Amino acid sequence: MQDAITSVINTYDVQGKYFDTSAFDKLKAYYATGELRVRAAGTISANAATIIKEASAKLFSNQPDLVRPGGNAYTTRRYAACVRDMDYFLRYATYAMLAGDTSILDERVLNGLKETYNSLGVPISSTVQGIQAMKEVTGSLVGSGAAKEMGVYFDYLSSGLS
Template sequence: MRDAFSRVVEQADKQGSYLSGEDINGLSALIADSNKRLDVVNRLTSNASAIVSNAYRALVAERPQVFNAGGACFHNRNQAACIRDLGFILRYVTYSVLAGDASVMDDRCLNGLRETYQALGTPGDAVASGIQKMKDTALGIANDSNGITKGDCSNLMSELASYFDRAAAAVV
């Protein structure tokens, strides 16, 4: 996993140049927003169980054919795996928010996930729907302005949404 600082230094080194004013301004903005990132990660982590379980319940209600007899996730073991996987994805989304980089999620969570679901006969679009449900709940929790660092969080919320979108796209 590379953080934003490592990426900027690596890129400048490859070009054999000093950090540009744009690079330094971008890193300064990241530092200024670090408390907001920590607030978001703390909120998501504190509410992880509810985010995952609510997404799972909504997914079961939306796609009962997947969870009823004959469905890909009928057995308790498969249902537990679904909940576990949603939790893994949420955890890696929080890592990505903290780092400001999706590479850890790509490398350690999403790489090969589509193929795994295909091999298990699990419909990727159902998993993607569950991820989108987590996204909706997580954005609501993260965007609540009570008790967090004040300021414009629209870019951070867009970034957070993009990590969920990236995960959903990886499974279909």
């Protein structure tokens, strides 16, 4: 993984240039938003169980067949795996929000999750619906700015699965 600071470091390293004015502008932009990110992450940490419970309720209410017999989320085992996946998605989106970069989602979330779900038979559209449900529930909790910030990484997860 790489955060925003390490991201700009790597980008300026690949051309072998020293930091220009724009690089310091990017770094100032990140450090300015860091404190909002820390409130957002602390709030989400406080309410991770609540967010996952509300999002799962919304997903399984909009798609009742998932947890009725024959659905992918029908058993205690497969339901528990589903809510474990949503818990991991939310915590990693919190990580990517604190870092200010979608890299950790590439290295530690999307790195083989697509074809793991594909071989498992997990429906992609339903998982996207669950990610969107976590997105709405989390935004309503963290307020407008942190909601936009978290939503960026949530749509990164959705598009990675899509």
